[PDB]
Design a protein around this ligand. Sequence first.
Ligand SMILES: CCCCCCCCCCC(=O)OC[C@H](COP(=O)(O)O[C@H]1[C@H](O[C@H]2O[C@H](CO)[C@@H](O)[C@H](O)[C@@H]2O)[C@H](O)[C@@H](O)[C@H](O)[C@@H]1O[C@@H]1O[C@H](COC(=O)CCCCCCCCCC)[C@@H](O)[C@H](O)[C@@H]1O)OC(=O)CCCCCCC
Lengths: 625, 517
Amino acid sequence: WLPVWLLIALPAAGATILLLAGRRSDRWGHLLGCAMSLAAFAVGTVLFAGMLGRSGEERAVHEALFSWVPVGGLQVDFGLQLDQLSVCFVLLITGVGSLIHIYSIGYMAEDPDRRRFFAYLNLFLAAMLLLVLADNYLGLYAGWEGVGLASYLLIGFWSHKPSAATAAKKAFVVNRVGDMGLAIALMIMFATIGSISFAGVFAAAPGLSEATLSAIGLLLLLGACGKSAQVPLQSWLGDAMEGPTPVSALIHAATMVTAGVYLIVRSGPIFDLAPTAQTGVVIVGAVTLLFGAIIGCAKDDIKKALAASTMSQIGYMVLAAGLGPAGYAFAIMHLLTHGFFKAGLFLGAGSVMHAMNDEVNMRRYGGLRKVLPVTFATFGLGYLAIIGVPPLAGFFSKDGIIEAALGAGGARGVILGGAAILGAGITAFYMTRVMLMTFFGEKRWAANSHPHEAPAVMTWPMILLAVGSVVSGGALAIGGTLSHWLEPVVGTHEAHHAVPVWVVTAIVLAVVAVGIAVAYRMYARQAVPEEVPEGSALTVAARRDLYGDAFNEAVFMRGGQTLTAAMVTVDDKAVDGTAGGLAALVSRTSDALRQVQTGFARSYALSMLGGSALVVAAILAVQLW
Amino acid sequence: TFPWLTVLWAVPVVGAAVVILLPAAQQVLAKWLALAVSVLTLAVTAVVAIGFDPAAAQYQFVESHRWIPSFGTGYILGVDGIALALVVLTAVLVPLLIIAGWNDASRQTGLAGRSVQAYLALTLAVEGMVLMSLVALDILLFYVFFEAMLIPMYFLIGGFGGENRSRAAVKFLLYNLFGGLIMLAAVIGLYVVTAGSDAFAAGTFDFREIVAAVSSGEFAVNPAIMNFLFLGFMFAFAVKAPLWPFHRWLPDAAVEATPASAVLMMAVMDKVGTFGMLRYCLQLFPDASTYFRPVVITLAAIGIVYGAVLAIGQTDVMRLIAYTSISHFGFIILGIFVMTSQGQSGSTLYMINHGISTAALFLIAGFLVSRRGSRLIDSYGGVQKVAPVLAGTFLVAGLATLSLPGLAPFISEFLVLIGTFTRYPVVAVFAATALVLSAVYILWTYQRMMTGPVRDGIGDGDRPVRDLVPRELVVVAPLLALLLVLGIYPKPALDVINPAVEHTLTTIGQTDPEPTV
Ligand SMILES: CCCCCCCCCCC(=O)OC[C@H](COP(=O)(O)O[C@H]1[C@H](O[C@H]2O[C@H](CO)[C@@H](O)[C@H](O)[C@@H]2O)[C@H](O)[C@@H](O)[C@H](O)[C@@H]1O[C@@H]1O[C@H](COC(=O)CCCCCCCCCC)[C@@H](O)[C@H](O)[C@@H]1O)OC(=O)CCCCCCC
């Protein structure tokens, strides 16, 4: 049979070889990386079929490889829990990663170190597979930090560009703040329950208290903010686009950001018993959705706009997950649809950039629809999916998420539904902006660029991504197949029929149409200006990424530097100061005493006659001291 | 039963004597003989570890002889899990340090041409004294070698090393020797107290006998006297293992000494301070250690955060690594004194992992510094383009010190943090902040030195940064392999460590708190 751990062991070994083989395998290393990603996809499909071939509890696969950290009461055993929730992420990761690897074959063809890039991709895939497969939170953390490392490495590619290195550092630092939150979560979990495994934790989940469970949930939410790039840990997405486009595709569509949603859903048993943590998750999801949409509206670079769109979509994920079992399944379904159409969009943008001589500013774009037909078609398919038009994949998933949010009930329900609807409308607006500025209007090209159609190796992955962004929605949404499949692992909330589904379906479509009309008037009816237009304070704020990076710079970079200078001063003047003062005191006393050595025999005789001190001391010892 | 521990600690010393006695013209042969001696010590350590049975008695390979009955001290050797871990660390590292410092002493003139021989002999003597201290089961013998191993390292710093080698060596030796003399005060106090107690035939230094007497309660002592003895031992070990704020000697010594000697200091030698804490401070003064646990826990956590912050603030690569090592020692002490199975096992595993990781990182940084002529962080840039292997190994070592789960140190740091929370939640969180701080001071340094445009004179000029030579690869690859192995599969180490730690806890009347649920 095929052991589940091969899924983790498959890419990692590849990466290992590609990292150790070096230039020896530079000529063909990418071939090995792509082959190994495809092998991982094949193994994932086989395991998914096997799970389908099982029924009930037999569907999930639990495999403990070895005892890992047998320290006292910890007794953590390295194990994998490939269940109905895990298999969905396995399929998403493996498939989208294989498609992105194939796309990178051509995207990185004209760039050296392609073998090293594919080594990093394999390490990334292995790390995320470990993240989603680990049956205990310690293995989850292992995959988590491995994914952080892989994201740093890939973003850090083209290290000669300082912007890429800075973006990689920022990404790792923010994700490490998230990992710190997750570490506190695990640490509280062990302190209270005494176990780290999913099974033991969830069995003991009913115990503890609302306060403790809420603390665990909030720390896990902080971790998700780290990986999922939700506020306040969202600023790292923008700069991360400095890396190669396939890196952005893998990070955003699946994997990296998907990690936070996976963590929230997997911990769902904890959140169900911690309503305050669920409220925090909901608040974070809504706020980050709105912020990402607002930022995307202003971003001029295609990469930045797509990053903002991903942030908003992951905000949708977080909102749905915070809704509880009423939204967990919807969160996962919309996550799969997002993987598909966002990967398609990122690959299309990468093809455009390659054709546009690496240009990223959408002002230079325009009229690309005709000159780049296949990439335009795939990008438009993903665009319809993310927009949420009925036929497209994202339609059903986003509609279900919005329905759950508005069905949360009361003030919570109305506010969440309104936030989701506004986010959908703004998504329509800024995606329409991107599309119009890119593929329509005058050429606006510069430097006599000569756009060429993407190669077959890059094109085929784009076509498959578009096919997914068209199909996956109906495939999972229609019939509640995803809901029934996740019911075993994810608690089934059933439904409450808060509002007639048709009213929400119509409201979402109306908001999307309003946004589309506004964008067409602004950029289609009106010619796209080639320069940044002045606008309301909100316009510049969004152009400055909602002044979120500035907040980090002023609070943490500046405050951190102040603290570092203070500590350096303490070390140099206070800590070392005590030893310096002691040494100076000893030296001064030594000089003073040496001054007593006057060199005159008579002075020494006087000191000796100071033996009267000895005499009086001996006598007084009898006089009671 | 062959006296395995006696051979273990004697072989480095005898080899040092032979190497220094070699003729000046035998520099290459001297290097090879020193490497052979280190490898022989490693083989002795390997046979000891293989024969070691973690399920057997607490102390194994025990050798006992009368050395100075007048002082109530005996030549008593014996290795437990804690001691065995550090013994393995030292034995594996020292050969790697020797092949790392292969050419470090070549530039030194004078000394009758024995510069290479002197360097190798000093390194071997440091190894021998460290091993002897680790295996010693007598308080006075342990102190003898603990204080003795300063002077060879003092010479190894002042001799060889940078321009400020004199000042750095003086500060090293004086801090550590002030601590050692403060220990001596407490050691004599312990002898006096034991002599004044009927639990022993006379003043005694046998560690096992005294530990048994204190645990059984027969050797009751006034809590004030035990507190003072514990304070003396703790001060000595805190200067030895750079517990904040007694750390200030380490940065200068580490930067001024040669990279191999600096690693021998921090990676191996300084671990003796934490080992002495874990063994003596806890098993001889369980009550005093328990009473002072809050204070030293706070000191260790402050050391962690403070060292991380300073490392962020350092403009010198080697000084940055030194402060990183200070913070990691803060972790080690925090894990030791939380008196939890998870905490203490994690602290021992962290001794091992930090030794290896700091060795790798500091040696790679030393290679890079040798390529150029300045240790300034800003002096470099884009080194990845010119030396892909050097930058890659530097990244891996930093990630190890950054405590990635794929590398050994995390398993240890995690284990410590876990153990910290079960007793001191706030301190655990305060320490966990060092997880972010490590990412900062590692990745920012990597960005500054390895990335961006190739700075002038890096890829060209009279002193280009050539990639790692084969010997440096021999030094690095084993360390990275050990990091990966102990990160993926730490169990072989823990199986050794966990029993001993349990015994220690069993001896000090401590047990990991039960979960609230
Ligand atoms: C609970 C604990 C939470 C605490 C987390 C805080 C982490 C530390 C933040 C600062 C940092 O993480 O490190 C920045 C500097 C060196 O910064 P840099 O110089 O490397 O980059 C500059 C850039 O200069 C390079 O980048 C450009 C582009 O390539 C090149 O053109 C240049 O030539 C050169 O290469 C450029 O010139 C400069 O103007 C910029 O300010 C660049 O920094 C910038 O920082 C800003 C903020 O920082 C961050 O992390 C953001 C995330 C912070 C995490 C917390 C977020 C909220 C969490 C709430 C729960 C961002 O907008 C970008 O991060 C951008 O990068 O370190 C230091 O002093 C550290 C001093 C002490 C730190 C210890 C903190 C306790």
